[PDB]
Design an enzyme around this catalytic site. Structure first.
Site: not given
Ligand SMILES: C[C@H](Oc1cccc2nc(N)nc(N)c12)c1cccc(Cl)c1
Ligand SMILES: C[C@H](Oc1cccc2nc(N)nc(N)c12)c1cccc(Cl)c1
Lengths: 286, 289
Positions: B222, B230
């Site tokens: 992130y 994923h």
């Protein structure tokens, strides 16, 4: 040197990727470990060199690509050299290239298994107390909050030769004793942590002109030594233990304690361990 | 014994790695050149005897049994590996360029008010991702599949990994379910999926590649590079870029966060790094100033 007549017994560790090397040698003839590491590049000075008459030797050439052995002037050949004398066995075993396995320590695992095995060891961290009592490195200190409870000492990590901002790396070592790691933290320490986060980043701002958003500020778990300490690093420096399997962001450690007072006593933590470490079999079973 | 051009002059440090002792330099001449300098690995025998006789050591400091020195060794330990690209094509400049990053601390409100709007204002294509799930491409390369369209996923080697050695093992878990753009979308509803990816995907890597689960860094990104959930599976001994704490979130913890705090990823502050010239960096920096 702090000894004479160094004689290599064993290469403990050697990385061509990090251009760093750990040597175990016998001296005065005692055990000593000498760590040597090629230093980071200084851009302005490489820039300058390359627009002079640098001493080059041509390896190969294929159209637009060419390889050369460059032999810079003394300035740019600095090699960071650290020495441990007398070296303990803890040192001689600690660096040996050994394989790393991942473990998931629960709250109960820590107090019933780890903490006891922790207490089953006696490692010297006299150098930390030396910084904290101004017995050593006193005038390398960059900032100090001097409160015995909520106070700390900001100081560059020995790793950093301080010759460039690319690898900026300071540690914040807390004055308060008895806080071995992340596992000891509770809402009680929120003021110490906030101090380190904010006062630490403010000191780096004024000293090195480096904004907080150029820093990754974290804690190791497991730490390399068991006295709470925070690592302040250049975001662009792949610092030691900044990988997710070890690094915990200070801001996140604060907001965790704010959201869940038992957070770091209850929650499962993931970290690596050497395969030669007896803590692993102790954690694997129970 | 000379550079094929004249008057080197730095435009831009395309990339530097203080940890690898390597720099990639864009410089002008006379037009475009790239110079890559890498400090070289130690020749151990040279160092060894050196330490037995008159090394130029200048002490920096000491503390207890520790001391740190500056060592200036003789020439054949100073060799620097110099690669030169002249002329540097605009491609070459693009390939080496690692952009200076800046940390942002994104709150739940910041995300909803600033980041999501910006994300939605673009059109990023995940057709390559849909083709794997649909089995129109790379079906030959799937290691494991849980074909359930809600809690199921496909486990597949990454492009970068040639599968000739487990040193740099790098598989990717892509879930079948659609619409999960990132960590921010993860609620407890997704726990069966997340646990599946973790537990089955690890099980699978043991069965296939005979590599135990405690040899694996299992994590999400992130911000992520493409906005379909994923998970990265990598050999722990191989520090893939992205595995840093400012980007990687372990699958094991993401799961347990949702167990403790169901609103965790819609409600808490997430920390990542954006490129210094990323219109999102600015936007976020404004709403916080
Ligand atoms: C982690 C510890 O680091 C230190 C040891 C002594 C003095 C130190 N002083 C400072 N300022 N910063 C540090 N990190 C220091 C250490 C242990 C064994 C070997 C090595 Cl290479 C480093
Ligand atoms: C991020 C994107 O990723 C992929 C694109 C297409 C097929 C992919 N297949 C696999 N297995 N794994 C991936 N990450 C794949 C991408 C874009 C440009 C070059 C490269 Cl090297 C990778």
């Amino acid at each position: 040197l702090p000894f004479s007549g160094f004689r290599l017994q064993k290469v403990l560790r050697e990385s061509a990727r990090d251009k760093i090397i750990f040597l175990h040698g016998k001296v005065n003839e005692e055990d000593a470990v000498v760590i040597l590491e090629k230093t980071p590049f200084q851009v302005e000075q490489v820039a300058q060199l390359l627009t002079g008459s640098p001493e080059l030797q041509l390896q190969f050439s294929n159209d637009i690509y060419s390889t050369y052995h460059l032999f810079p002037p003394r300035q740019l050949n600095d090699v960071k050299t650290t020495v441990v004398y007398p070296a303990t066995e803890k040192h001689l075993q600690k660096y040996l290239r050994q394989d790393l396995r991942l473990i998931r320590e629960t709250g109960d695992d820590y107090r019933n298994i780890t903490l006891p095995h922790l207490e089953s060891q006696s490692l010297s961290i006299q150098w930390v107390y030396n910084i904290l009592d101004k017995k050593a490195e006193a005038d390398r200190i960059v900032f100090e909050n001097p409160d015995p409870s909520d106070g700390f000492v900001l100081i560059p990590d020995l790793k950093w030769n301080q010759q460039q901002l690319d690898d900026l790396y300071l540690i914040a070592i807390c004055h308060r004793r008895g806080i071995r790691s992340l596992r000891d933290l509770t809402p009680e320490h929120l003021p110490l942590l906030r101090n380190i986060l904010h006062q630490g980043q403010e000191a780096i701002l004024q000293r090195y002109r480096m904004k907080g958003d150029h820093l990754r500020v974290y804690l190791h778990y497991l730490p390399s030594y068991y006295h709470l300490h925070v690592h302040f690093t250049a975001l662009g420096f792949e610092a030691p233990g900044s990988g997710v399997e070890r690094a915990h962001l200070l801001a996140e450690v604060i907001e965790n304690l704010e959201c869940d007072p038992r957070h770091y006593q209850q929650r499962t933590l993931t970290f690596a361990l050497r395969a030669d470490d007896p803590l692993l079999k102790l954690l694997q079973e129970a």
